[PDB]
Amino acid sequence: TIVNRIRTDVVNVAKSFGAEYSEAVIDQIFQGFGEKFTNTGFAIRVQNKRNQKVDCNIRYGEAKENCLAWDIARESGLLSDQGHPVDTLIQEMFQAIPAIAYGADFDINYGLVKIWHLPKIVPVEEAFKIPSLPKSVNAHIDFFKKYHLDALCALTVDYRNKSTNLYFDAHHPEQRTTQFYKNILQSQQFEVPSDEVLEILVNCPEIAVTFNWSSPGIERMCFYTAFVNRETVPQHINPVLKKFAQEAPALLDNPGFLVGWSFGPKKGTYIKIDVDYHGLVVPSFFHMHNLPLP
Ligand SMILES: CC(C)=CCSP(=O)(O)OP(=O)(O)O
């Protein structure tokens, strides 16, 4: 079955990258969501957020107007009350802005970590009316305006990290220059990457910004770039990129990949890479950002 193949592939990735994981957590996740994994926009992610340790996450999205993952997770015990603003945030998001899709992310050593809301691209002001957003979001209105973050294309709630991300369609001509990325990173006193990386970032169609309830500033930002096959991933930049691009499992022999380049002060600077397990994620990514499939 597809669900058994997926579970085996997930465990094999965790073993190969040395990622921490719990068999009991994987059982809980698949009891709730394994069927969803078989026929939606499913991806396996690895990231090198920690020193000499790779973490493994699995995630999916699907085109429903309602947040099915929240109900499944609550009924399943994967999402308990946190005693925290996150407890109502996703519900407020779905009340404030109509969604065309939703998704959910799981850490295989922990359980459910994120749920996201996918609207049609909307003006970022539509988000400011959400009651339980961190105060730092509304406090960054001028920052958003200055860096052409006006086209909101997703929102995420991170229940484990107690943070929220706003996602922007990086449509503006200034976002096609390397100086834009140097400027936005320097505005936060974040680490500026090499020229090679900057030349990859100028093609980013999606920019995420992370906010939390413990600081007035941006926690980290992330630049997303997609690659249509294993070979066009920039494997030479980091050994996790090379190993995952060459060895990640999928239902197709040569799948596409989504790479997230994260930057922070703390740490917050690392790479994330997701395999398009069924082949739906990467075309969907280009289509939602009004770009042709390269
Ligand atoms: C890609 C967007 C639309 C939802 C996925 S959640 P993410 O991987 O961007 O979240 P992190 O900030 O990396 O934890």
Swiss-Prot record:
Enzyme Commission number(s) of this protein: 2.5.1.159
Keyword Transferase among UniProt keywords: yes
Binding locations of dimethylallyl diphosphate: 45, 59, 114, 165, 167, 220, 224, 272
Keyword Transferase: yes
Record-level Gene Ontology MF annotations: prenyltransferase activity
The organism's place on the tree of life at top rank: Bacteria
Enzyme kind, highest EC tier: transferase
Activity regulation (UniProt): Activity is slightly increased in the presence of Mg(2+).
InterPro entries: Aro_prenylTrfase, Prenyltransferase_CloQ, PrenylTrfase-like_sf
UniProt xrefs under SUPFAM superfamilies: Prenyltransferase-like (SSF143492)
UniProt note: domains: Hapalindole A and hapalindole U are fixed in the same hydrophobic binding pocket, but they adopt completely different orientations, which define reverse or normal prenylation.
Role played: Prenyltransferase involved in the biosynthesis of ambiguines, a family of hapalindole-type alkaloids. Catalyzes the reverse prenylation of hapalindole G or U at the C2 position with dimethylallyl diphosphate (DMAPP) to generate ambiguine A or H, respectively. In addition, accepts hapalindole A, an epimer of hapalindole G, and catalyzes normal prenylation at its C2 position.
Family statement drawn from the similarity comment of this UniProt entry: Belongs to the aromatic prenyltransferase family.
Descriptive protein name: Hapalindole dimethylallyltransferase
Species annotation: Fischerella ambigua (strain UTEX 1903)
